[PDB]
């Protein structure tokens, strides 16, 4: 019957959304790889994609990675 709707609602409650910042437009693979590995290391990396040279960082990690970026590039 339609407790198919019930399984849809359950899956709907398994959606996750985060505030933060998408980083993109990198000159070099090196720099993209440097910041995302730093973000991975301090636990604030939520998503990345090597081929697009993009990643997303949580809000609470935002200034740590900006400050790392100023210091190391």
């Amino acid at each position: 019957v339609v407790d198919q709707i019930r399984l849809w609602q359950l899956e709907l409650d398994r959606v996750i959304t985060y505030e933060g910042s998408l980083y993109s437009d990198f000159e070099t693979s090196q720099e993209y790889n440097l910041l995302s590995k730093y973000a991975q290391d301090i636990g604030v990396l939520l998503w990345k994609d090597d081929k697009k040279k993009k990643f997303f960082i949580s809000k609470e990690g935002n200034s740590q990675v900006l400050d790392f970026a100023k210091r190391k590039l």
């Binding site: 959606v15 985060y18 939520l46 900006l66």
Partner: peptide, 16 residues
């Protein structure tokens, strides 16, 4: 080189 604020939504393909 660029940052933009946003909301990252992570969900099953069905819900996407």
């Amino acid at each position: 080189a660029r940052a933009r604020k946003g909301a990252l939504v992570q969900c099953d393909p069905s819900i996407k």
